[PDB]
């Protein structure tokens, strides 16, 4: 396993800023830490690196200790809102970062092409955009053969093509065997590429699992909309006694809500009879799950429309 | 001690005029009669080393052309070469060569004595404390000492309480004091040159006298030292390169770093048209000696121009014409000879160094360079010093350098 956090408890003074977190990241998975901007996410991201030390437990990066020099040669990182040395060049910043991590200089000009920075290389860092610097900060994270990545807000300021092309680079890496970690604050946009999310509140760790495992645990409805449905009335009432609200839409269509523990028993009941006619399933998204788990154990909702 | 008549003098002319032929003589000699004796150049009147060699007691004696050698050295009994009594009025001592360890010309109580054109080489081995005076003058009125050459005596031309007399054109080399003055009221001295001397001109307590055209070349620690001189006139003196050293005796002065002019308690005197060149101190003005007419000099090349340890203001320009200063960074818009801005030679930080010598370690600091510049920007912190409105732009002493 890549990261094996076995019950750590980080504390600054008297208060415990991270209370009994216990994670386990497999070597091919893509994990996403989601929490508010307090001490929930960013202290746990530092404990994986060598920046802090667990005051009650221990971590295990790649089956070692988190500050060994053999570890950090095969570990990228990308912090949120970095600005590099503005009088240097694009290429000379990477050639400086190549000698520190021990990666060869031949890998530098590949990586400037790999993030699409070859046209704006050999120019000053001060005449770069916000999204242009994020390509450079990504390019140093792929130095060497990184067996672990920690991308903290990797897609802000980027093009929507370049956002989409970034996750194609991500999905290449998680098939090549390098587990990575996302740390984002925009949940649609990462919710297609998260293999298993690790949403946590202010203090503790709330829920970790796959997206199927979160929706099966958090009882939350689904919108199983189905057009072209024949005969419309006994098909309508057979969900009402089943415990659903069948909306008799006019254009031979029936909207079926559920609780998604009865998910699979309705899909074959919509597919096995022979008249589904181009249905649409609308699962509850990640921010709806984020709305649930924060309201489950860590606040109240805002007033009717406030924030 | 024989007499001058005990020699063999050949008379050239029968008007009490004698002529001693070439040939050596011996012992002391005494003039008791008004005999105008001359000498051939081979007349080496060499004494044995005791007594005053040529004592003169008669008036109107024209001693000429003698060559004296090795008289005594008892300075208490005044072993001179030529002793001149008060009754020996109007003596002429012309063109003589002297070599001996005592007084060269000791006169006292005389009137109109003339010591002209002589060469008095004093000594070589004595420590400049027992060599005796070159031309000693003790309370004489009317004297005329002109164009002599005294070398390696003790304290040069000593003058004590002599009222009216001229010192014209005489060369003084490698002695302790060049010219010493003691209570010589209404004196005068013109065009004298002092070289390599532990004090160029001692001017002690003598009033109303004229110091004009004199030169001081490479003297030690005191160029012209004036103590308690009143109503004097210092016009045209050239004092050059007063280097540091020590006088060796420290009797009336102390050792100095090199001062071209040291004014001590001199109240009224005109100090004009002088030239103070390349010494460590151009002029030292003590606190008791203030308010005297100092205008027209040339303070060139000195490492520190004026030393004035006071807080009283001192204008150094009479009738709107001042002195030429080498470091005067000024301009002249209205095309006169005068500069346009006044020149303060001293800062406030230039007087902290005189008051406290430990500031010399801090003298290269940038804060000191701040402290020199803050006075130039804020004149409230400028202590009232030794400034002169309208300084000169060109050298006024263009003739004294030849």
């Amino acid at each position: 396993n890549a990261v094996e956090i076995q019950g750590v408890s980080q504390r600054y003074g008297s208060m415990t800023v991270l209370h009994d977190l216990n994670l386990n990241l497999g070597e091919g998975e893509v994990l996403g830490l989601f929490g508010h901007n307090g001490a929930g996410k960013t202290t746990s991201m530092k404990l994986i690196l060598g920046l802090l030390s667990p005051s009650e437990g221990q971590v295990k990066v790649l089956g070692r200790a988190p500050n060994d020099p053999q570890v950090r040669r095969q570990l990228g990182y990308l912090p949120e809102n970095v600005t590099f040395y503005p009088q240097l060049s694009g290429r000379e910043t990477l050639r400086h970062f190549a000698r520190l991590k021990g990666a060869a200089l031949t890998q530098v000009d590949e990586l400037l092409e790999q993030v699409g920075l070859a046209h704006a290389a050999d120019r000053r860092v001060k005449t770069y955009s916000k999204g242009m610097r994020q390509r450079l900060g990504l390019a140093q994270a792929l130095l060497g053969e990184p067996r672990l990545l920690l991308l903290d807000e990797p897609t802000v300021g980027l093009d929507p093509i370049a956002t989409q092309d970034l996750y194609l680079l991500i999905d290449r890496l998680r098939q090549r065997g390098t587990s990575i970690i996302l740390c984002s604050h925009v949940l649609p946009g990462v919710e297609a590429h998260i293999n298993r999310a690790a949403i946590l509140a202010k203090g503790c760790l709330q829920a970790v699992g796959s997206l199927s495992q979160l929706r099966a645990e958090a009882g939350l409805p689904v919108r199983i909309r189905a057009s072209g449905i024949s005969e419309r009335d006994s098909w309508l009432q057979r969900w009402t006694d089943a415990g659903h609200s069948a909306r008799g839409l006019s254009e031979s269509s029936i909207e079926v809500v559920a609780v998604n523990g009865h998910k699979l028993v309705l899909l074959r009941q919509l597919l096995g009879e022979g008249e589904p006619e181009d249905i649409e399933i609308h699962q509850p998204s990640l921010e709806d799950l984020y709305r649930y788990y924060m309201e489950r154990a860590g606040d109240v909702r805002a007033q009717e429309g406030r924030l | 001690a024989p007499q001058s008549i005990t020699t063999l003098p050949l008379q050239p002319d029968g008007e009490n005029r004698w002529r001693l032929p070439a040939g050596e003589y011996q012992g002391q000699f005494t003039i008791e009669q008004p005999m105008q004796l001359r000498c051939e150049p081979g007349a080496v009147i060499q004494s044995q080393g005791q007594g005053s060699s040529l004592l003169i007691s008669a008036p109107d004696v024209l001693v000429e052309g003698c060559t004296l050698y090795e008289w005594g050295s008892d300075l208490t009994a005044m072993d001179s070469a030529v002793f001149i009594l008060p009754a020996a009025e109007r003596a002429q001592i012309s063109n003589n060569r002297m070599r001996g360890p005592g007084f060269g010309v000791f006169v006292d109580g005389t009137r109109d004595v003339q010591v002209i054109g002589n060469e008095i080489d004093g000594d070589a081995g004595v420590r400049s404390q027992d060599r005796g005076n070159g031309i000693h003058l003790f309370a004489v009125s009317g004297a005329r000492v002109l164009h002599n050459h005294v070398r390696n005596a003790r304290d040069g031309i000593y003058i004590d309480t002599s009222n009216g007399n001229h010192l014209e054109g005489n060369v003084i080399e490698d002695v302790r004091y060049g010219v010493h003055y003691m209570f010589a009221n209404e004196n005068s001295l013109i065009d004298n040159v002092t070289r390599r001397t532990r004090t160029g001109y001692a001017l002690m307590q003598s009033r109303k006298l004229t110091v004009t055209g004199n030169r001081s070349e490479q003297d030690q620690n005191y160029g012209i030292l004036m103590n308690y001189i009143t109503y004097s006139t210092i016009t045209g003196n050239f004092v050059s390169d007063v280097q540091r050293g020590d006088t060796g005796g420290d009797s009336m002065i102390s050792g100095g770093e090199g001062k071209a002019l040291f004014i001590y308690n001199s109240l009224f005197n005109t100090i004009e048209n002088n030239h103070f060149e390349k010494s460590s101190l151009g002029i030292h003005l003590t606190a008791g000696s203030e308010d005297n007419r100092i205008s027209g000099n040339a303070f060139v090349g000195n490492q520190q121009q004026v030393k004035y340890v006071a807080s009283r203001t001192q204008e150094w320009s009479v009738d709107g014409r001042g002195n030429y200063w080498s470091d005067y960074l000024g301009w002249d818009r209205n095309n006169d000879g005068l500069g346009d801005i006044a020149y303060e030679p001293n800062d406030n930080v230039d007087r902290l160094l005189w008051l406290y010598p430990q500031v010399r370690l801090l003298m290269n600091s940038p804060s000191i360079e701040v402290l020199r510049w803050v006075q130039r920007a804020f004149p409230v912190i400028k202590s009232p010093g030794v400034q002169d409105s309208h300084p000169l732009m060109k050298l006024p002493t263009e003739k004294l350098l030849t």
Partner: protein
């Protein structure tokens, strides 16, 4: 009016600058300290040329500390592009910034020369209170004008650059040039030519430096010596009267403010 509504911001933003209040209290404790040393020595014409030299070093400094980031400090801060979408013009958010920063310099020198007057009327016994009020009234309404000149310079050098690190380099360059380089270039032109470059043009070269026009206004009555003036002793060769010297100081504002508006209009 909108010019006062944006002036009320800068009046409440410049007074929270802690770097201003350090060097505006430094202007107060030095203007008392110069006027206290002028009381123990008595003279009178040296404390005018030293107070005018103190405000030569500090009233350009407080003006350039305020307004070097007035335009470019709002442009890279993002709040300038927002402000143009408010019902304003580019001429109102500049004249409003000039009124807002101008009342700070009118108050930073009323603290400084105000406490200098109380360190004279309570220190020098038997002083003429009419002559004190008249001389320090001329110091108050002319050190603002020297401050408003360098305020209008700072709007010129902020609209031209597009990065705040380069605005601080130019504001330090303008403060070095007008205060203690132009006084030394004019000194070195007079020394090395020995006053024979131009006997009539060189007094008119004082009008191309607003710190020298500022010193020539306050040293009108109390001339005294020439060595306290130094390079400012060329003012006796100027045939211009004193009233035009006020207007030549006001023309340094209006030229360098209309230039500040013409640069900002094509931002």
């Amino acid at each position: 009016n909108q010019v006062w509504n944006i002036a009320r911001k800068e009046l409440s933003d410049g007074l929270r600058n802690r770097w201003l209040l350090a060097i505006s209290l430094l202007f107060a404790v030095l203007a008392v300290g110069i006027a206290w040393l002028g009381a123990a020595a008595s003279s009178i014409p040296a404390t005018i040329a030293s107070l005018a030299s103190l405000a030569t070093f500090l009233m350009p400094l407080i003006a350039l500390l305020l307004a070097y980031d007035a335009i470019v400090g709002e442009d890279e801060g993002g709040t300038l592009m927002l402000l143009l979408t408010y019902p304003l013009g580019r001429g109102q958010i500049l004249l409003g910034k000039f009124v807002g920063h101008g009342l700070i310099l009118a108050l930073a020198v009323l603290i400084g020369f105000g406490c200098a007057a109380l360190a004279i009327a309570l220190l020098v016994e038997g002083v003429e209170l009419g002559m004190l009020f008249w001389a320090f009234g001329r110091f108050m309404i002319s050190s603002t004008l020297l401050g408003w000149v360098f305020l209008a310079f700072a709007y010129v050098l902020s609209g031209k650059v597009n990065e705040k690190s380069s605005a601080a380099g130019l504001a330090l360059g303008v403060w070095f040039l007008f205060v203690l380089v132009f006084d030394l270039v004019l000194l070195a032109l007079l020394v090395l030519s020995e006053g024979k470059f131009n006997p009539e043009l060189l007094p008119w070269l004082l009008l191309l430096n607003p710190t020298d026009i500022y010193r020539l206004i306050n040293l009108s009555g109390f001339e005294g010596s020439g060595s306290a003036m130094g390079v400012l002793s060329l003012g006796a060769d100027l045939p211009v009267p004193a009233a035009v010297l006020w207007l030549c100081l006001l023309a340094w504002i209006g030229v360098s403010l209309l230039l500040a508006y013409a640069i900002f209009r094509r931002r």
